[PDB]
């Protein structure tokens, strides 16, 4: 709505599950906050997906992440409010981009995969 460019935007139902998973990953220390950390994880090839916010006045500051994702074959999704994403990330300050990282034998695996599928079901 406010961000018409955010083609892969999640609905209200999906945002709750996304933020719950982000908070759980933060509990397990499987989350990286900020665009720079997401880019670092993508380059390292340790991330699995990126959750980004659609509210940012210099919006293109996040636009580098999707293309790099297409370079690294990683799903990405957009969220409405950056404050809610930051609260889910465990940071009071607004966060516009976060990444979820792979750990060997992680208990979140299945949930991760489930959300992954949803993103592929959201794309077009």
């Amino acid at each position: 709505d406010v961000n018409p460019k955010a083609y892969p935007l999640a609905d209200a139902h999906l945002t709750k599950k996304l933020l719950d998973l982000v908070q759980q990953s933060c509990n397990y220390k499987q989350l990286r906050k900020g665009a720079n950390e997401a880019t670092k994880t993508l380059n390292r090839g340790i991330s699995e997906f990126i959750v980004m916010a659609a509210d940012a006045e210099p919006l293109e500051i996040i636009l580098h992440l999707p293309l790099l994702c297409e370079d690294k074959n990683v799903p990405y999704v957009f969220v409405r409010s950056k404050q809610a994403l930051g609260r889910a990330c465990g940071v009071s300050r607004p966060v516009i981009a976060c990444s979820v990282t792979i750990k060997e034998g992680s208990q979140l695996k299945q949930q991760i995969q489930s959300i992954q599928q949803s993103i592929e079901r959201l794309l077009v």
Binding site: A12, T15, K16, L19, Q23, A84, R87, A88, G90, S92
Partner: protein, 84 residues
């Protein structure tokens, strides 16, 4: 949508609630609605709290301190059971 809170806010909220409860109990004691708290005595704490009186009759002191410990323990257990 439901919103989470950072660990800092969780710690601050828990600390504020605990301080509120402690101030509530202390001011209840101030106004006479609550008896002044008794020292918490265990086996190690026995000779420090009731040292001048345990020599009078040690077995009664042992019974009293064990009764206090069991009262605390059973209060914890009944709180758990009621919460079940």
């Amino acid at each position: 949508l439901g919103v989470y809170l950072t660990k800092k806010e969780q710690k601050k909220l828990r600390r504020q609630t605990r301080r509120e409860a402690q101030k509530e109990l202390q001011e209840k004691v101030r106004l006479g609605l609550m008896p002044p708290p008794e020292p918490k005595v265990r086996i190690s704490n026995l000779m420090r709290v009731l040292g001048t009186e345990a020599v009078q009759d040690p077995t009664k002191v042992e019974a009293h301190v064990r009764a206090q410990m069991a009262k605390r323990q059973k209060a914890h257990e009944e709180a758990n059971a009621a919460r079940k």
